[PDB]
Amino acid sequence: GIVEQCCTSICSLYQLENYCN
Amino acid sequence: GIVEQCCTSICSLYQLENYCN
Amino acid sequence: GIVEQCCTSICSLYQLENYCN
Amino acid sequence: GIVEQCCTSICSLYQLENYCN
Amino acid sequence: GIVEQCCTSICSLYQLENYCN
Amino acid sequence: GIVEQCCTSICSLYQLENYCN
Amino acid sequence: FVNQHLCGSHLVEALYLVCGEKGFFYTDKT
Amino acid sequence: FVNQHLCGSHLVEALYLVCGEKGFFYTDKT
Amino acid sequence: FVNQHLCGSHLVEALYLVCGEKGFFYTDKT
Amino acid sequence: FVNQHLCGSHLVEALYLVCGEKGFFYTDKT
Amino acid sequence: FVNQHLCGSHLVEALYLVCGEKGFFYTDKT
Amino acid sequence: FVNQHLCGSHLVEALYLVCGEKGFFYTDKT
Ligand SMILES: [Cl-]
Ligand SMILES: [Cl-]
Ligand SMILES: [Zn+2]
Ligand SMILES: [Zn+2]
């Protein structure tokens, strides 16, 4: 999930765009 | 939606809870 | 205090309401 | 209060310090 | 500057990138 | 740098003023 | 609770505070 | 420690900026 | 590590939302 | 320091930055 | 991306999200 | 752990408040 991927390691804008609708 | 109720106007707590999963 | 209670463990809205006036 | 001085108008730093414990 | 483009008006992503080092 | 000084230990307002232009 | 207009990130912020482990869905489509 | 609460507080704001009109579904469980 | 500064930064905002008109007294010492 | 209108959470945020270990009292009762 | 007026801290916040390791320069001198 | 990303997110806002009209140069490398 987003919380196991973007807390231990930083997520870029492109990585954060995956979880958008 | 959520903006027209809580941003255009003022929301209460139980109106906030209407958008929780 | 709030800082030894709501940093090590997360505090809910009801727990945060204790410290209000 | 604090809002009518720093939000309604603009506050300085030493006016900010007036609300510290 | 940055404010008159993104705060006075609306900026896009590639206009945001113009202020990165 | 600011990131090795103001993350491990907290920086005051005066310490943060060093990095301003 | 606060009685104001929440807008922008603030909106979601309160959704993060009120919902909690339940989660929330955020859609600003008018 | 790895405080997933404060971290999700930043993630939800970043998602509000990234998604925009699309919106997003957020759950603190995967 | 358990950075009580960044954590209190979130706590004070959450308290501003929760207390509302009542207000709150905050001290980083208990 | 910044010369603007601070409102909402921002208000308290600067109270968190300026006071520090002293602490602050926040009462928005007009 | 979001299509709104970013102002105040929000401005820099998005500069923190978009640039990344590149870094940014912030000058509000009109 | 010492998450320099979330910490820099707070640092850049604090710098926006402290510097004001002067501005600041921020780099996550020193
Ligand atoms: Cl705002
Ligand atoms: Cl954090
Ligand atoms: Zn704001
Ligand atoms: Zn944080």
Numbering used by the authors:
A (entry chain C), B (entry chain A), C (entry chain C), D (entry chain A), E (entry chain A), F (entry chain C): 1 to 21
G (entry chain B), H (entry chain D), I (entry chain D), J (entry chain B), K (entry chain B), L (entry chain D): 1 to 30
Paper text:
Finally, a 2.5 Å resolution X-ray crystal structure of its hexamer was determined through the newly developed multi-well X-ray crystallography technique of Turkish Light Source conducted at ambient temperature, elucidating the conformational differences between the hexamers of both INSv and IAsp. Molecular replacement with a dimer in the asymmetric unit facilitated the solution of the crystal structures of INSv insulin at pH 7.5. Specifically, amino acid residues 1–8 exhibited a “T” conformation in one monomer and an “R” conformation in the other with well-defined electron densities. The hexameric configuration of INSv is organized near a crystallographic 3-fold axis aligned with the central channel. However, unlike the IAsp structure, a distinct feature of the INSv hexamer in the R form involves the outward orientation of Asn3 in chain B relative to the interior of the channel. This spatial configuration leads to a less stable electrostatic interaction with the two symmetry-related AsnB3 residues. According to b-factor analysis from X-ray crystallography, significant mobility is observed up to the 26th residue in the R state form of INSv, which is clearly reflected in the H/D exchange map. The INSv analog demonstrated higher deuterium exchange compared to IAsp (after a 1440-minute reaction, n = 3), displaying a more kinetic conformation for INSv analog compared to IAsp, agreeing with the findings of B-factor of INSv crystal structure and DSC analysis.
